[PDB]
Amino acid sequence: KEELKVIYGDNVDVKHFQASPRTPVQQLFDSLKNAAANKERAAKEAAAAASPYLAYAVTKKQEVQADPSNIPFDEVLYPQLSEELLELELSDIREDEIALEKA
Amino acid sequence: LSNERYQLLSQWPDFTTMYGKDFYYRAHPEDLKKFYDAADEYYKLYETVTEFDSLSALASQVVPNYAARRRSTVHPAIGSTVADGAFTNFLLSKQ
Amino acid sequence: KKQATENLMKLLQAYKDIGDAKSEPLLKNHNPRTFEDRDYPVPDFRTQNLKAGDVPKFFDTVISTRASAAIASKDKFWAGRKTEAEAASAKASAAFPRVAVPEWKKGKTVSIENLNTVTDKYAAALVPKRKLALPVLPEGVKKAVEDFAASVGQAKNASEVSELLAKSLAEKAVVTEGGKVVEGFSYVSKAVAAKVIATRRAEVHERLLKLWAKRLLVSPELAIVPLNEFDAQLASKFEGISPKYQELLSAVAQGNK
């Protein structure tokens, strides 16, 4: 909910994004839904920064954090870790099905 | 002197090149907790060595004791070598 | 403190080295299910002389003792791995990059053309080492395709053909490691993995509903002992079963008359 209220407001209905999480193209399409306000807010922050060092730090951190390719997907970074993260639930579902096949 | 301490916080190894989850799960849990504590410790040391607005009130703690040593009843520039040499002259003269 | 942090980095590199010497899964050695003995002799509760409410505590001590043994075997593995990596971290390289701080001399100053270079070295480590090349639609192609639709005359579905270009570029998004495109890389998303989890949960749940459907079509009196209260009734002998539901399950089973 904390990493989702940045986009979809505070009353966010977490059950829809827990039942079916956002596909990468939907993460991209709601990054770009809020890109103009991010650009205007970052320009307003780098104007009102205390020093030109902080102004350059604001614009650099935003122009890294505005490119939607830089969203770290754990499945692209660590594929055989996300596969074990999938098998971590598929294994206990298989244990339940093993008990039901024994019954 | 804070530059001399900053220069050896400048040769600290980059722990941020070992934050990824391939380093998370290969490592023993207590060693990873020690590693994250070491990173937090470096951020503490670097945040306090670059507090250069503290050096003025640090210099104001060396000023009063030194300035009271120079309000000497003999001389502002007197020391132990000149006073011992003058005791050598005084004692080895005719009383 | 610098030497201890460098020894910790040599230790983490040795952990990754001797964990990828064995090519093992990442989560496997942190999962204490894999250190659990599933060929355990499984103590039968009918020999252990239990009264009515004494069987779930027996089940809890058996489960907790097997979980404690699994966690202790996991800890024994990690102590062995720590010894194997502390003995091979001493024979290592220790050629790490240094933390990017601004270069400040002894009596001189520091310039903004170097502080900016240091923040560039910071934000160049925010980009991931392998990333989806998710294409944002450039404006020069967006206006071009909108006017190309306007010359056909369908300029009021130019928004839909624009989002169709962006969606067709986003759905075939390829990955890049260092800007060089990775040849032959397939990734399973999080929405795909959660759909797989949801279908697997739904089919195992319909197997549970089928199980209890058969059991309540044959003997529907079983719906009067609740599921949490069932294990509290057992004992080691059959006559030691608590008589709370014996009379009720006997008299409900004889039908509605």
XYZ file of C-alpha atoms in Angstrom:
455
model
C 0.000 0.000 0.000
C 2.893 2.365 0.675
C 4.511 1.750 -2.708
C 1.096 1.842 -4.403
C -0.388 5.041 -2.929
C 2.267 7.039 -4.821
C 0.264 6.261 -7.968
C -3.304 5.297 -7.119
C -4.026 7.585 -4.154
C -4.279 6.618 -0.518
C -7.544 4.623 -0.613
C -6.091 2.103 -2.995
C -8.048 -1.217 -2.561
C -5.006 -3.433 -2.009
C -6.936 -6.664 -2.738
C -6.975 -6.032 -6.496
C -3.187 -5.620 -6.615
C -2.613 -8.518 -4.229
C -4.892 -10.908 -6.111
C -3.386 -9.832 -9.444
C -0.206 -7.730 -9.249
C 0.674 -5.176 -11.878
C 2.222 -6.532 -15.045
C 5.389 -4.668 -16.179
C 3.483 -2.853 -18.915
C 1.013 -1.604 -16.308
C 3.874 -0.462 -14.068
C 5.214 1.426 -17.077
C 1.799 2.823 -17.955
C 1.221 4.211 -14.474
C 4.726 5.589 -14.210
C 3.972 7.631 -17.350
C 0.567 8.531 -15.907
C 2.367 10.640 -13.295
C 5.470 11.767 -15.209
C 4.410 15.366 -15.849
C 3.656 16.109 -12.198
C 6.966 14.454 -11.287
C 8.821 16.678 -13.765
C 7.095 19.850 -12.567
C 7.596 18.945 -8.895
C 11.273 18.149 -9.492
C 11.809 21.452 -11.292
C 10.056 23.223 -8.414
C 12.315 21.390 -5.951
C 15.531 22.097 -7.848
C 14.515 25.742 -8.035
C 13.965 25.893 -4.272
C 16.992 23.764 -3.381
C 19.362 25.217 -0.809
C 22.380 25.086 -3.140
C 23.229 24.135 -6.743
C 24.677 20.866 -5.477
C 21.288 19.879 -4.087
C 19.630 21.150 -7.272
C 21.800 18.910 -9.443
C 21.217 16.022 -7.037
C 17.450 16.521 -7.300
C 17.437 16.608 -11.105
C 19.837 13.661 -11.379
C 17.893 11.481 -8.935
C 14.670 12.367 -10.707
C 15.965 11.792 -14.241
C 17.139 8.384 -13.071
C 13.850 7.810 -11.230
C 11.731 8.960 -14.196
C 13.104 6.613 -16.845
C 10.682 3.663 -16.581
C 13.287 1.146 -17.699
C 15.092 1.658 -14.370
C 12.284 0.107 -12.309
C 14.067 -2.895 -10.777
C 12.060 -5.995 -11.642
C 13.206 -8.855 -9.420
C 12.194 -11.326 -12.131
C 14.475 -9.696 -14.706
C 17.318 -9.202 -12.234
C 17.074 -12.574 -10.476
C 15.062 -15.013 -12.591
C 16.101 -18.202 -10.827
C 15.394 -16.480 -7.521
C 11.866 -15.501 -8.535
C 11.361 -19.082 -9.716
C 12.224 -20.324 -6.222
C 9.949 -17.636 -4.810
C 7.178 -19.138 -6.944
C 8.028 -22.683 -5.860
C 7.954 -21.508 -2.237
C 4.149 -21.352 -2.491
C 3.679 -24.085 -5.080
C 5.501 -26.475 -2.734
C 3.099 -26.037 0.165
C 0.125 -26.176 -2.200
C 1.622 -29.478 -3.378
C 1.883 -30.581 0.259
C -1.832 -29.879 0.716
C -2.599 -31.823 -2.450
C -0.408 -34.689 -1.211
C -2.476 -34.829 1.981
C -5.702 -34.766 -0.035
C -4.458 -37.554 -2.298
C -3.597 -39.604 0.772
C -7.083 -39.047 2.177
C 42.747 17.082 10.883
C 39.209 16.402 9.662
C 40.722 16.265 6.192
C 43.113 13.597 7.455
C 40.199 11.561 8.788
C 38.161 12.198 5.625
C 41.053 10.898 3.523
C 40.799 7.535 5.272
C 37.050 7.521 4.990
C 37.832 8.052 1.314
C 39.609 4.687 0.992
C 36.658 2.711 2.346
C 35.494 -0.132 0.082
C 32.210 0.140 -1.779
C 29.743 -2.041 0.094
C 26.952 -0.922 -2.241
C 28.418 -3.250 -4.881
C 27.300 -6.170 -2.655
C 23.687 -5.254 -1.882
C 22.105 -7.437 -4.546
C 20.027 -10.474 -3.731
C 22.596 -12.876 -5.138
C 24.763 -11.697 -2.243
C 21.811 -11.737 0.157
C 20.931 -15.403 -0.116
C 24.392 -16.879 -0.504
C 25.492 -15.367 2.794
C 25.074 -16.575 6.347
C 22.360 -14.483 8.059
C 24.527 -13.178 10.895
C 27.281 -12.200 8.471
C 24.781 -10.284 6.356
C 23.497 -8.557 9.493
C 27.094 -7.645 10.359
C 27.591 -6.363 6.811
C 24.515 -4.141 6.941
C 25.607 -2.881 10.362
C 29.014 -2.057 8.871
C 27.337 -0.050 6.108
C 25.235 1.845 8.673
C 28.419 2.457 10.665
C 30.181 3.972 7.644
C 27.213 6.272 7.058
C 27.499 7.375 10.688
C 31.235 8.076 10.373
C 30.843 9.932 7.088
C 27.909 11.985 8.333
C 29.916 13.099 11.355
C 33.282 13.745 9.688
C 31.611 16.162 7.250
C 29.904 18.183 9.983
C 32.274 21.095 9.450
C 29.915 23.508 11.220
C 31.008 21.828 14.463
C 34.689 22.717 14.170
C 34.148 26.289 15.341
C 32.626 25.258 18.642
C 35.331 22.619 18.901
C 38.008 25.292 18.477
C 36.298 27.338 21.182
C 37.185 24.582 23.688
C 40.956 24.885 23.105
C 40.926 28.679 23.308
C 40.192 29.335 27.036
C 42.767 27.020 28.647
C 45.492 28.161 26.253
C 44.549 31.799 26.759
C 44.680 31.305 30.518
C 48.154 29.820 30.198
C 49.244 33.023 28.440
C 47.958 35.228 31.251
C 51.027 34.313 33.227
C 52.237 36.479 36.070
C 55.789 36.251 34.701
C 55.506 36.653 30.933
C 53.239 35.556 28.070
C 56.207 33.912 26.335
C 57.826 32.266 29.346
C 58.403 28.539 29.351
C 60.310 25.846 31.194
C 63.579 26.084 29.259
C 64.057 29.835 29.764
C 63.000 29.599 33.400
C 65.418 26.724 34.014
C 68.223 28.629 32.298
C 67.471 31.655 34.428
C 67.512 29.473 37.529
C 70.884 28.225 36.322
C 72.081 31.826 36.156
C 70.431 32.768 39.445
C 71.568 29.820 41.523
C 75.142 29.731 40.190
C 75.630 33.441 40.810
C 76.790 34.740 44.180
C 73.498 33.926 45.983
C 36.555 -0.728 10.868
C 37.698 -0.458 7.248
C 39.536 -3.775 7.568
C 36.514 -5.452 9.152
C 34.222 -4.207 6.392
C 36.713 -5.404 3.789
C 36.881 -8.804 5.491
C 33.082 -8.900 5.430
C 33.090 -8.155 1.712
C 35.689 -10.872 1.139
C 33.475 -13.200 3.185
C 30.390 -12.354 1.130
C 32.350 -12.899 -2.072
C 33.550 -16.241 -0.695
C 29.959 -17.151 0.195
C 28.852 -16.387 -3.354
C 31.901 -18.231 -4.733
C 31.431 -21.485 -2.820
C 27.681 -21.273 -3.226
C 28.057 -20.998 -6.977
C 30.709 -23.700 -6.953
C 27.878 -26.028 -5.929
C 25.409 -24.158 -8.227
C 22.719 -24.559 -5.587
C 19.392 -22.698 -5.489
C 19.394 -19.376 -3.677
C 16.472 -19.845 -1.272
C 17.127 -23.537 -0.637
C 19.582 -23.236 2.240
C 17.599 -20.480 3.939
C 14.420 -22.525 3.719
C 14.215 -24.806 6.783
C 11.730 -27.060 4.995
C 14.643 -28.465 3.011
C 16.486 -29.316 6.238
C 13.486 -31.256 7.551
C 13.496 -35.048 7.759
C 10.350 -36.144 5.931
C 11.257 -39.817 6.399
C 10.822 -39.430 10.145
C 9.617 -42.429 12.203
C 6.393 -40.379 12.991
C 5.337 -41.404 16.538
C 1.959 -43.110 16.619
C -0.381 -41.463 19.105
C -2.122 -44.704 20.062
C 0.834 -46.033 22.056
C 1.493 -42.846 24.042
C -1.494 -43.263 26.429
C -3.369 -40.011 25.945
C -6.636 -38.894 27.497
C -9.312 -36.822 25.720
C -7.733 -33.399 25.534
C -4.140 -34.670 25.461
C -3.745 -35.549 21.766
C -3.344 -32.034 20.220
C -0.583 -31.279 22.714
C 1.123 -34.503 21.596
C 0.760 -33.384 17.974
C 2.162 -29.965 18.861
C 5.220 -31.390 20.607
C 5.908 -33.749 17.699
C 5.560 -30.928 15.155
C 7.593 -28.479 17.246
C 10.336 -31.039 17.884
C 10.600 -31.805 14.178
C 10.642 -28.088 13.353
C 13.299 -27.479 16.010
C 15.374 -30.308 14.559
C 14.990 -28.844 11.064
C 16.059 -25.382 12.229
C 18.989 -26.861 14.168
C 20.108 -28.785 11.081
C 19.856 -25.562 9.070
C 22.046 -23.846 11.666
C 24.546 -26.713 11.527
C 24.715 -26.321 7.750
C 25.283 -22.593 8.037
C 28.020 -23.062 10.630
C 29.727 -25.502 8.270
C 29.330 -23.078 5.364
C 30.701 -20.235 7.494
C 33.764 -22.309 8.358
C 34.243 -23.263 4.698
C 34.047 -19.607 3.623
C 36.089 -18.119 6.467
C 38.806 -20.611 5.561
C 38.733 -19.481 1.911
C 38.213 -15.750 2.409
C 41.794 -15.461 3.654
C 43.015 -16.676 0.251
C 41.310 -14.066 -1.902
C 41.738 -10.854 -3.912
C 40.278 -7.855 -1.987
C 40.382 -5.573 -5.028
C 37.159 -3.637 -4.516
C 36.145 -0.217 -5.810
C 36.189 2.547 -3.239
C 33.230 4.606 -2.077
C 32.803 7.632 -4.319
C 33.391 10.629 -2.059
C 34.302 14.100 -3.387
C 38.046 14.534 -3.790
C 39.055 17.141 -1.209
C 42.720 18.022 -0.751
C 44.439 19.172 2.446
C 44.231 22.949 2.319
C 42.406 23.357 -0.967
C 38.681 23.221 -1.690
C 36.268 20.995 -3.586
C 34.597 22.058 -6.825
C 31.044 21.449 -7.962
C 32.368 19.818 -11.146
C 33.564 16.959 -8.916
C 30.630 16.815 -6.498
C 28.414 16.439 -9.561
C 30.670 13.639 -10.816
C 30.239 11.929 -7.452
C 26.444 12.124 -7.669
C 26.677 10.766 -11.214
C 28.573 7.816 -9.750
C 25.777 7.498 -7.186
C 22.869 7.563 -9.616
C 24.686 5.263 -12.042
C 24.284 2.584 -9.360
C 20.542 3.189 -9.157
C 20.035 1.670 -12.613
C 19.807 -2.124 -12.302
C 22.421 -4.484 -13.702
C 19.765 -6.075 -15.946
C 16.646 -4.162 -16.873
C 13.551 -4.322 -19.009
C 13.895 -1.933 -21.936
C 10.361 -0.660 -21.395
C 9.882 1.834 -24.247
C 8.321 5.152 -23.402
C 6.788 6.513 -26.591
C 8.860 9.422 -27.952
C 6.939 12.544 -28.891
C 8.373 12.661 -32.412
C 6.879 9.267 -33.260
C 3.650 9.921 -31.358
C 2.795 13.096 -33.267
C 3.877 11.436 -36.517
C 1.499 8.499 -36.109
C -1.300 10.783 -34.888
C -0.986 12.940 -38.004
C -0.638 9.814 -40.170
C -3.991 8.741 -38.749
C -5.307 12.277 -39.287
C -4.489 12.158 -43.008
C -6.533 8.954 -43.276
C -9.195 10.867 -41.339
C -9.374 8.709 -38.200
C -7.874 11.442 -35.991
C -10.395 10.798 -33.210
C -8.930 7.316 -32.640
C -5.385 8.691 -32.704
C -5.287 8.258 -28.917
C -6.151 4.577 -29.293
C -3.566 3.960 -32.013
C -0.991 5.774 -29.849
C -1.669 3.610 -26.806
C -1.710 0.613 -29.149
C 1.833 1.466 -30.296
C 2.971 1.961 -26.710
C 1.306 -1.283 -25.584
C 2.707 -3.298 -28.492
C 6.172 -1.942 -27.741
C 5.768 -2.603 -24.021
C 4.475 -6.161 -24.418
C 7.487 -7.107 -26.531
C 9.952 -5.459 -24.174
C 13.405 -7.024 -24.394
C 16.022 -6.916 -21.625
C 19.480 -5.332 -21.657
C 22.337 -6.200 -19.326
C 24.728 -3.299 -19.850
C 22.904 -1.676 -22.721
C 23.835 -4.700 -24.812
C 20.685 -6.728 -25.415
C 20.610 -10.189 -23.843
C 20.211 -12.916 -26.452
C 17.593 -15.473 -25.480
C 16.264 -14.255 -22.127
C 12.885 -15.428 -20.843
C 11.413 -14.095 -17.614
C 8.297 -15.108 -15.697
C 6.582 -12.002 -14.371
C 4.988 -11.461 -10.991
C 1.468 -11.329 -12.410
C 2.146 -14.570 -14.293
C 3.506 -16.232 -11.145
C 0.520 -15.029 -9.146
C -1.876 -16.366 -11.780
C -0.103 -19.734 -11.565
C -0.448 -19.606 -7.766
C -4.131 -18.680 -8.013
C -5.053 -21.503 -10.410
C -3.115 -24.001 -8.290
C -4.855 -22.766 -5.124
C -8.244 -22.918 -6.832
C -7.793 -26.495 -8.014
C -6.496 -27.722 -4.643
C -9.405 -25.940 -2.961
C -11.892 -27.655 -5.244
C -10.199 -30.934 -4.317
C -10.842 -30.108 -0.655
C -14.463 -29.259 -1.419
C -14.812 -32.553 -3.306
C -13.308 -34.438 -0.343
C -15.717 -32.994 2.175
C -18.559 -33.277 -0.346
C -18.088 -37.050 -0.515
C -17.732 -37.315 3.256
C -20.906 -35.307 3.893
C -22.897 -37.061 1.201
C -22.158 -40.426 2.784
C -22.370 -39.420 6.462
C -23.790 -35.908 6.928
C -23.616 -36.102 10.725
C -19.920 -35.123 10.557
C -20.937 -31.455 10.269
C -21.783 -31.290 13.999
C -18.234 -31.680 15.325
C -16.349 -28.516 14.306
C -12.973 -28.850 12.640
C -11.054 -27.081 15.391
C -12.709 -29.231 18.063
C -12.058 -32.575 16.399
C -8.508 -33.355 17.572
C -9.472 -32.520 21.156
C -11.757 -35.584 21.190
C -9.265 -38.339 20.434
C -7.272 -40.567 22.755
C -5.012 -43.566 22.397
C -7.810 -46.085 22.974
C -11.152 -45.805 21.230
C -13.028 -45.874 24.523
C -11.010 -42.888 25.697
C -12.592 -40.672 23.046
C -14.457 -37.839 24.753
C -18.206 -38.549 25.043
C -19.136 -34.965 24.155
C -20.087 -35.793 20.564
C -20.487 -39.586 20.806
C -24.182 -39.534 21.715
C -24.931 -36.683 19.330
C -23.127 -38.266 16.369
C -24.856 -41.534 17.197
C -28.339 -40.039 17.324
C -27.962 -37.668 14.361
C -26.741 -40.522 12.130
C -30.039 -42.397 12.523
C -31.813 -39.869 10.305
C -34.341 -37.085 10.624
C -37.001 -39.185 12.382
